[PDB]
Amino acid sequence: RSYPCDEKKDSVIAECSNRRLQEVPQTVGKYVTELDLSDNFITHITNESFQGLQNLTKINLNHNPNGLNITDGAFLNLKNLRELLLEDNQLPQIPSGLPESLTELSLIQNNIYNITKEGISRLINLKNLYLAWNCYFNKVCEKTNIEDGVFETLTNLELLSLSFNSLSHVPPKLPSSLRKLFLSNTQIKYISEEDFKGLINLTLLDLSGNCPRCFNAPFPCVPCDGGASINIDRFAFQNLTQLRYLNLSSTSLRKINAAWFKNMPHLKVLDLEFNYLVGEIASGAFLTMLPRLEILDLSFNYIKGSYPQHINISRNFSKLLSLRALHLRGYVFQELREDDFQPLMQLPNLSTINLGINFIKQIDFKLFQNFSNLEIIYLSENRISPLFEFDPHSNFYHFTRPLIKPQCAAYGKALDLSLNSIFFIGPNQFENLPDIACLNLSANSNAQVLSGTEFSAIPHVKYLDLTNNRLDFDNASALTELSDLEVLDLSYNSHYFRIAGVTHHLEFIQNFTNLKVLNLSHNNIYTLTDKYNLESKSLVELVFSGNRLDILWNDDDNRYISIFKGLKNLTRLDLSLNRLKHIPNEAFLNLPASLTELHINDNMLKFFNWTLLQQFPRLELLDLRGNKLLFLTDSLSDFTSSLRTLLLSHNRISHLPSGFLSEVSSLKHLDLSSNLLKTINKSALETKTTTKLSMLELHGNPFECTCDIGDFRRWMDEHLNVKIPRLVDVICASPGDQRGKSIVSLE
Amino acid sequence: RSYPCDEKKDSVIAECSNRRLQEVPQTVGKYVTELDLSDNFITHITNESFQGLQNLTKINLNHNPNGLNITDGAFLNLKNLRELLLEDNQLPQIPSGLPESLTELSLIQNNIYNITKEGISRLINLKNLYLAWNCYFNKVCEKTNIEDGVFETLTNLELLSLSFNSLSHVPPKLPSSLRKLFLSNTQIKYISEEDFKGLINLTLLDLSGNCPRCFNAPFPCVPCDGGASINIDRFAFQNLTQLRYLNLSSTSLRKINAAWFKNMPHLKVLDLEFNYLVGEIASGAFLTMLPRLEILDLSFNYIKGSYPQHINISRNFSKLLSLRALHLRGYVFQELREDDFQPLMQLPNLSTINLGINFIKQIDFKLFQNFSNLEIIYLSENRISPLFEFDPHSNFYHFTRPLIKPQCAAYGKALDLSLNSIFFIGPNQFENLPDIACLNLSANSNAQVLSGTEFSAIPHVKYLDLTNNRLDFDNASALTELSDLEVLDLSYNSHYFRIAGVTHHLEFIQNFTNLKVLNLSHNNIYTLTDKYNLESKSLVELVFSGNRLDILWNDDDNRYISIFKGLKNLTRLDLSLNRLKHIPNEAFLNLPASLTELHINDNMLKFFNWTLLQQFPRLELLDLRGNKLLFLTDSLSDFTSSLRTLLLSHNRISHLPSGFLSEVSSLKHLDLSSNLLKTINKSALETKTTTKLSMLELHGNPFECTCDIGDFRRWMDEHLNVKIPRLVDVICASPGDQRGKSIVSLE
């Protein structure tokens, strides 16, 4: 059994991160090819640290300690080492004598202010070199000294990242093999004709944050003198014929020289966020030079103090023939009229329009159907009413997550109106809209009684998100006009459910023939009017977490005893966070017999009647984590033959009964972590048929490490197929001499 | 040192509740007079349980186990026992042979269905007898058999509670000493002329829940046949001359016979909630019979399916000369006009008007100034737009907490408009209002930019609650028209603070000369525009919990390093829940030197620079609970001489340095509970000057119970003035033979 790392298997990885290791372990497997030692307390690396580990092709030593002192030539003997990650290590210099076999070296987030030939010129096989985030913002640091011609001999270098360093000028003598050059936030004020002359294979250039736009910056921002623009020579990109990505975000540009794109026939992504381009958006000659551009980001170009009535889009936007996505967040305007987006309406592949954060008060929604083929209409965070801190591996100027949840967008045309003020959906709200399949009305402070007519203009919505509103469910016909509804999210609409004296109606759930997923989470549901039961012939998943089944299933009330029984097709049920101390036997028996997955985690269960699992012949996963269960049944095989996963972590199990792990043949994963187990007896492990378990979790139990743990230690040796992860965390609580150590220590 | 109970001192109480006791402890102090053993696991009480404890006047055995088996005459030997609480014990009968000295006996929430002479007729000194909640709702239980004349000989009985039992009729032969008779939810359908004839000292009668109004009930409700009213004979209350309280809530009354009140000259509180009295409210002859009534509750009398335009209040309400509070929640009407409350406007002491939960859409607010002296205008939970489950010791039909927070109401006239839809405050919103001192606009979905003019019609607001809105703090003059503002609550307005790209302005805080308390909690504040500092010459308390000081005080940003320095008069600061891993030394030094109380609890602090406490000579309380601190300074007296309270529970302190508890002379309370202390060495406790501590918390530490704990055990004996609460929870983690036991039980 591997210790202290966990080994996963054209390679074998030793997962050894975040285990409080004070030194590199001298017990790593001879066959290991990738060693992850990140987030440990290692303070020193010497030529003896990785001795006899010649198969290593990758080492990750990021975030060590919690600076790391690496001796000259510490990694020199590792002849197949290709990838070395040494991020966030407070390194004062590039380590000396690094192995010549390196193809990837990451030194992000260190204190390296000198890039010398001694450090990297001998690394002739380098393909990717990351030196970003060594001197930036108000960090006490020196200006970066790039030794003349340091990168020149790295003739296989394809990616060079020097962003978030004080460079002042583009380094001369860069190798012509470069494909991606990152120079964001480097204090480069001028780009000359010769700065990139030999870079004929360059596909990406990032010059963002040079002469930044600093008003309301969420980081320490130093603008160029007088808030001046970056000065790019007319011929600076004349030989960058292969450029596909260009990032000029936050370069304080007011004018874009169209000639910059004269010899960029393949430009695909142009990022111009955080500039002063309102004038250029209205009359952009550069827009005629970009017929293959697919993504154009012009977000946050607003004029401080100016809140115009309308957006002014140049007729030249009609020349962006290949445009697929247009981002115009933070332009800031009051109304979107149909005439305002006429230049975009004949672009055949424009599928995404992003107008988030524009303080838009009104939109003529009929304009969207006149676009060729919109698939994502993102209008989140507007004022529409009734009709280290930064991840160095992420985009600094915008979030990279999808605008709309992929599960919602997969259904078809999406309209996101979340975080607006549509407090009431009137009869004309969704008129003249395309066939919307995915609709998000989350966080619109909507307190209306939906009554079956509000969505009649878009009746083919398949995924509806109404979360975080104050909806008053007081009409049995609510949402029934949505005949094709498959996913309905009503999470966080507790406002009226929490008032006992008002009426509450959930009868509409029964009317849907295609409803698959329903989320009623965090609604504080504890009382219903007249109809106490949820019914659906189609529903497969119900999320009922954050409600009050402790009240609904109170021992003195029989009204909700069959609340979920009518969900005849249900396979997944989540009853977590319902303050349950016990479930009445009759209420558990009335859960749908079709269940395959049942979660009752994060309640306060003191008892669980295991005998009742007999009535659930399809139950594969039972999750009882985060409860107060004191014991386990000694005859689980008599009550279930389908259970494959049993999650019991964070409970108070102090003893396993005799014959527990052996008899349940279908059980593959048993999680007993964070319980109160002191020991595991020989009787508890084996009986007649050996264990069909493949994973047994035991970290966080207060084990007694005396000779009484010997039987379990021998069982672990005889059952190497049963994985017990994180042995470093399966720790001795007693006696004093063994406290803090893993149970696998002491013979 | 008392064990297992904690003794507080004309009596001495042994607080022994909720400590997992399996039996009554045989180590209670001889001098103890009140023993609280509630919420333990005691299963048996015998004549040996309280042997030699003759000074006991009160025993509380509620909620035991987690039924309790009490033998005949178990408490008979206790000659001064006056109060016996045996609630929630699943008792099948009233215990036999109870001591004759009893004056108070509570048997609430048991399985007692027979009240016999054998059980209580010998208890001639009984003053209060509680038998409520033994058979109710859908509990499987028998009808209550009251033996004829069982209470007749209890000639000192003043309070009898039989509520939530199936009685069917008022028991005959009740003693004339009765003052309070509770018969709520007892299935009594008829009240005859003789049911209370001899009860001439009765001050309270509760007949609620008999023939209940069951529509939308939040509990199992059985109405009288045909939803019929309770049938009260015309002469049923003719001799109840001393009645002050009458509860007829949920008796399905449609008519109130005015003759019922003909001989009740002192009636003060009349509860008529959950009835069908809309007609009676419009033409109530009974209102002329109640000139001394102070509280009238007519809540939840709405007509199902009827949402009238106006409320119809009889002119006879003008005859309620002594009325102080009128509760009209759940009447249900669309608009409140000035003409509608004319009958109430000349009542000189009417200080509270409660119109919560009426779905009111509009109010002519000018009507409130024409009332004689309104102090509480409660309009929470309406539709106003821009111009066991039940506690047996509480009121079942309404909450008893104050309508308005006492801290807000103490300032003067209060107007509560919380939970409405005043999403924008227009220039006439607060016109024609009285001099409002306390204003609650919480949860109104308000997303406006307050700009210094919204509150000009009520400029003397002292306590303003704007919590749980979507406020856009984007104007330096916000709220500055409120010159006398003392308390401002902006909690839970994170909507716009979360968005980096929008501007955020908190400059207005400086303009107030009388602002004492400011709550900016749970606002997710991580970026401000231009002015990075909070400033106030007056502010004494700032609650900044649930914000992002981890981002504001990021090591690479100097902009917020003096964020609180300008709060020159600050004494209390709460920095909890700010995800802090460390505070930069310069930022801690810029906290106001005027601080007396500083909370930094529930962060993730790994280090705390104790030396910096030198710059805080007035610091009395330091709260660092719920962090990851690994060690404590060995020279705290060199850094502070004012610190009185130091809270360090829920940290990772594994060792106390030498001379820690002895040298800090001002330290009175040190909380080290839930840390990783294995022992406390003799050197850590004493040095030259003995400890001035009065409370040392240590429960939850994994103590090693070998002879190495002997020195601390001897120190505990030599320092009985240093209180250590919950010794039952100061437990041995090792060796195995001592695990689970209290450290004081060792040897």
Ligand SMILES: *[C@@H]1O[C@H](CO)[C@@H](O[C@@H]2O[C@H](CO)[C@@H](O[C@@H]3O[C@H](CO)[C@@H](O)[C@H](O)[C@@H]3O)[C@H](O)[C@H]2NC(C)=O)[C@H](O)[C@H]1NC(C)=O
């Ligand atoms: C409908 O609109 C709402 C509001 O815009 C969407 O909610 C947002 O959902 C995202 C993705 O789940 C949340 O961000 C995520 O946060 C987690 C951490 O909590 C992080 O691990 C992820 O990387 C990601 O950043 C976001 O907080 C949430 N916003 C709010 C205000 O709730 C919702 O997803 C939309 N629904 C559909 C159907 O697209």
Ligand SMILES: *[C@@H]1O[C@H](CO)[C@@H](O[C@@H]2O[C@H](CO)[C@@H](O[C@@H]3O[C@H](CO)[C@@H](O)[C@H](O)[C@@H]3O)[C@H](O)[C@H]2NC(C)=O)[C@H](O)[C@H]1NC(C)=O
């Ligand atoms: C309300 O409940 C629904 C249903 O459970 C929530 O949506 C579901 O969210 C889970 C993640 O918690 C999604 O599963 C994940 O899918 C990805 C992609 O396949 C996978 O990589 C993950 O391992 C995981 O399986 C699930 O697909 C999604 N279902 C739907 C229909 O969208 C929803 O997030 C809940 N709403 C709130 C506000 O919490």
Ligand SMILES: *[C@@H]1O[C@H](CO)[C@@H](O[C@@H]2O[C@H](CO)[C@@H](O[C@@H]3O[C@H](CO)[C@@H](O)[C@H](O)[C@@H]3O)[C@H](O)[C@H]2NC(C)=O)[C@H](O)[C@H]1NC(C)=O
């Ligand atoms: C302004 O109006 C809001 C909304 O009505 C008031 O909030 C409410 O405050 C009460 C008292 O703090 C909360 O109830 C309490 O809950 C705790 C448990 O959380 C319980 O221990 C207490 O016995 C009591 O029931 C109530 O939850 C809360 N409601 C909401 C929706 O936030 C607020 O107090 C008002 N402010 C002033 C100045 O009067």
Ligand SMILES: *[C@@H]1O[C@H](CO)[C@@H](O[C@@H]2O[C@H](CO)[C@@H](O[C@@H]3O[C@H](CO)[C@@H](O)[C@H](O)[C@@H]3O)[C@H](O)[C@H]2NC(C)=O)[C@H](O)[C@H]1NC(C)=O
């Ligand atoms: C926003 O912060 C304010 C200021 O801390 C919160 O109000 C304060 O709440 C505390 C309780 O957490 C009150 O103290 C208590 O007072 C009672 C009565 O004197 C006493 O019995 C308790 O032992 C405790 O001392 C304090 O008086 C109150 N201050 C004011 C000015 O009202 C407020 O609750 C916070 N808002 C939210 C929504 O969390």
Ligand SMILES: CCC[C@@H](CCO)Nc1nc(N)nc2cnn(Cc3cc(CN[C@@H]4COC[C@H]4O)ccc3OC)c12
């Ligand atoms: C992404 C942009 C973020 C900032 C930028 C500020 O330059 N804009 C805004 N930030 C916040 N937080 N809330 C709002 C609300 N509207 N706008 C848009 C806006 C309104 C005006 C009118 N000025 C108000 C008139 O009355 C007195 C003044 O307060 C002027 C300019 C403007 O946006 C350019 C907001």
Ligand SMILES: CCC[C@@H](CCO)Nc1nc(N)nc2cnn(Cc3cc(CN[C@@H]4COC[C@H]4O)ccc3OC)c12
């Ligand atoms: C404290 C009272 C609780 C219940 C009682 C219902 O019997 N009332 C209400 N409960 C909830 N949750 N929300 C609302 C919103 N308004 N009202 C008041 C009300 C509205 C109508 C009109 N009927 C609707 C429109 O036509 C079709 C229906 O949907 C009729 C009667 C009525 O109150 C007596 C609500």
Ligand SMILES: *[C@@H]1O[C@H](CO)[C@@H](O)[C@H](O)[C@H]1NC(C)=O
């Ligand atoms: C390298 O790994 C292979 C298995 O993949 C093993 O046979 C060989 O002995 C290893 N050599 C060293 C030096 O670790």
Ligand SMILES: *[C@@H]1O[C@H](CO)[C@@H](O)[C@H](O)[C@H]1NC(C)=O
């Ligand atoms: C690095 O550690 C070596 C020993 O492993 C020591 O000799 C050397 O001084 C250390 N370097 C620094 C800068 O502390």
Ligand SMILES: *[C@@H]1O[C@H](CO)[C@@H](O)[C@H](O)[C@H]1NC(C)=O
């Ligand atoms: C430029 O890239 C091509 C492949 O796209 C490659 O053949 C050529 O050698 C590269 N040039 C250099 C100098 O690496």
Ligand SMILES: *[C@@H]1O[C@H](CO)[C@@H](O)[C@H](O)[C@H]1NC(C)=O
């Ligand atoms: C539009 O997208 C399709 C699909 O990739 C592609 O075939 C077509 O050439 C694109 N049209 C333009 C004008 O770029």
Ligand SMILES: *[C@@H]1O[C@H](CO)[C@@H](O)[C@H](O)[C@H]1NC(C)=O
């Ligand atoms: C609709 O869009 C087309 C481009 O596809 C444009 O020619 C036409 O004028 C637009 N008409 C309206 C009414 O928007």
Ligand SMILES: *[C@@H]1O[C@H](CO)[C@@H](O)[C@H](O)[C@H]1NC(C)=O
């Ligand atoms: C539900 O709302 C519709 C539309 O307003 C109404 O016609 C219907 O009567 C309502 N149903 C009930 C039972 O209130």
Ligand SMILES: *[C@@H]1O[C@H](CO)[C@@H](O)[C@H](O)[C@H]1NC(C)=O
């Ligand atoms: C909803 O379904 C029920 C049958 O369960 C039916 O009585 C009702 O009319 C349906 N309403 C709509 C609008 O489909």
Ligand SMILES: *[C@@H]1O[C@H](CO)[C@@H](O)[C@H](O)[C@H]1NC(C)=O
């Ligand atoms: C049950 O669920 C499956 C899977 O989603 C679905 O195909 C089937 O139609 C559902 N059954 C009914 C009766 O709707």
Ligand SMILES: *[C@@H]1O[C@H](CO)[C@@H](O)[C@H](O)[C@H]1NC(C)=O
């Ligand atoms: C499980 O529930 C049944 C009733 O459905 C009951 O007979 C049985 O005693 C329960 N099991 C336990 C262990 O209490």
Ligand SMILES: *[C@@H]1O[C@H](CO)[C@@H](O)[C@H](O)[C@H]1NC(C)=O
């Ligand atoms: C009763 O308490 C007093 C002290 O208040 C003590 O002197 C006396 O001995 C006690 N008697 C018994 C029997 O506990």
